[model samples]
Target: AAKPFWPSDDLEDVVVKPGAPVAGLALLAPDDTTGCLFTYASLKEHDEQDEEFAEGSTVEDAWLYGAKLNHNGPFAYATGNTTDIVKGRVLCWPAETFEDKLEEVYIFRKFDPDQPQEGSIRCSIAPVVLRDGSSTDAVWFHQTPE
Candidate 1:
């Protein structure tokens, strides 16, 4: 593993309150061993004894501690229909990523039913929680405009 980006709660902008989502990465300095910055940019293409960050590629992608999805939040995720009804829709990220602009952001809204599945929410990219639990895995979703 990439040194296991294990972040602490004392680091700046890392931990604050409880019952909230915490997202960050391991970005240790060239000479840092105190685990201060846990953000690290890894190049999946290169794995050698002498690897240098590409244009500061060691830049962190702020990993997470897991995310829990309930029927609440601004997004208003669908609740248990138990009625045996099968409904589906989509949500989109409002805008584009500034390469490193969109970080640890939370935007939620009820999917509009007036428009088509892709029309209800207008966005270019969005975070889709794939796993549940603190420091879970979420993904930035984007697709070709039809």
Candidate 2:
């Protein structure tokens, strides 16, 4: 059997209480028919909405399950296909849209068949380049990496 992180023997700071402020993350999804982007305050809230509605719930179970598997960074691609792109713009405040003073935020798409490059309106995340038209499920705001 494999070792587990839940019951680890490395007991230094593993059992300490929460001591730091963390930048919270949120998820975005577009409506199937309307193509309007919707934001979830957190993954837990997304789960609640998923359970409450049956028909109009754009966020699916498969996507939610995959979120935990691949969240090693501050930004991650939206789950599922590029067909999820919305025709309109997202109008809601996520976690920290104003405080960070982000002039424009973008979701990048990789649809180039020849050179294999991403397309975008060109936004940057200090170290990363965010392109024009793509979708992402997870996003966070923080000055430092913790």
Candidate 3:
């Protein structure tokens, strides 16, 4: 499979609510399968870190707890669908080691009715923690195959 393309939500003009821990957004794409892009934007204070996976690892398995935006917001995601999903995280660091804020985004390729055997796709972003112990966030993205 070809390595997928990942884009930054920062340049996409995403607006976040005040004091929202992590904001969830989704964009639907017109295609045979139900495809869309989703993102989680954070408005908390924390340290940022480069996104990475463990050596020889493709999937990220970790325990994370945070807030998600209400479905009424932009980029809202729907449930129960076979979609290709990719996600990425971006962090803002003020100090050398401390993270200030974090954000996450995901691109999902909808399932194709022509190909029913293909399973759902999933991807994950590396998690980040802030130095001040204010908050933590993970960024990631993924997409379904044609």
Candidate 4:
């Protein structure tokens, strides 16, 4: 089961509200049975030395309060579906990290599959210096012949 702060509504069942994307740490599901992205907004704020996280374990806190990025299309995912459904995806960090070029992060699609889609919604680490050493705030959907 997933933790709350998880909105009562599912994205697919609701209207696409306009606002900043929900940014946070994207963690792996402990049980492969959960075929959705587990996200956390406050886990990193916890003290590393806290007794609950003693021995350097945060797994319990991480999964306890995350939103599962469940979707119906692009394709349907269910329990027992492999994690490969989201291979190569990373945390959508903030642009300042990339503006300063302090680290190597990526801005990937929210519901990317093993292959590719032309117009899927995208996400960033708030997100990143492009893999080709380029940087920009603008995002594009799909590809075209050069």
Candidate 5:
């Protein structure tokens, strides 16, 4: 049997509020692989900043898929998992670095084969504190409640 897609809503409607900091997390890829990182940039900013890769530009020779978040706020650990604490921050780094630092914890939702792809996925690129009180930076993707 096929599983249903977890989140089927727009990022702005689900996670990003009018006055909020627009914070959250996302799954970059399976097990953190190497590649260019996506960020929250306006069309103009993306064009100006990443002149090489303009907004809406297709990334040839790169894998592409759609994903969504099912929860709100920073990725949190299950209760009593004192060894893994996430301090509501997002981080991003080269895939090689992330794979090397596998000890650092990260949360991600796999792509659902049953869901249709549409709308923007909300994600946060900041730093977070882990359960052992250690910290790392990562891009977080999540959804907000209506």
Candidate 6:
């Protein structure tokens, strides 16, 4: 379980320390690839290159395994189709990229889509969306839902 959280449990003993290394998120991908969007100084592991399915939980059975993201207020869609228009595609894999109807979609999550490791650029966290949408991103836990 471990899911019901909010101002209770002994005030939630909070301890968040981040004095350094957060802006490591990459707007850079093709250095040969695999730094799709690593943060905290890019130690790497925002799915760390996206494609190694084994266990299970929908996104094609964990191709994103232990997911983590935080694009900051990133949730908008004209028709991006997280199942034909309701919504839901962070791990259950939905790298939607609508390049037509205004084009503001972004989901990148892919460290190794068609299999990599032969020479690197196999892509890690490739939320690739360019050619004029400007840019911005988020998703780690994504809470505030009291």
Q: Which ranges in model 5 have alpha carbons more than 4 Å from their true place?
A: 1-120
TM-score against native, each model: 0.15, 0.17, 0.17, 0.17, 0.24, 0.15
Error of 2 at 125 (Å): 22
Model 5 scores worst on lDDT over the 10 consecutive residues at: 56-65
Q: What's the lDDT of the predicted structure labeled candidate 5?
A: 0.35
Candidate number with the higher lDDT (1 or 2): 2
Number of clashing residue pairs in every model?
Answer: 20, 4, 22, 7, 17, 15
1-146, model 2: which lDDT tens digit per residue?
45655656566657776767755322223321122222223423332243432123233211212111122322223333434331211222333332221222222112222222222212222111114434443222211111
Give stretches of model 3 more than 4 Å off: 1-72, 78-80, 84-98, 103-146
lDDT of 1 by residue, 18-53 (tens): 778656332223443222112111212221112331
Residue-level lDDT of model 4, residues 10-117, one tens digit each, is 867675767858755433224322211112332122222234422222122111111123332232222232342321111222343322221111233243344343
- Cα error, residue 124 of model 5, in Å, equals 1.4
Q: Name the lDDT of candidate 6.
A: 0.25
After TM-score superposition, what is the CA distance of residue 72 in candidate 5 from its true location, in Å? 10
Residue 85 deviation, candidate 4, in Å? 18
Instruction: At residue 85, give the lDDT of candidate 2.
Output: 31
- Roughly what TM-score does model 2 have, to 2 decimal places? 0.17
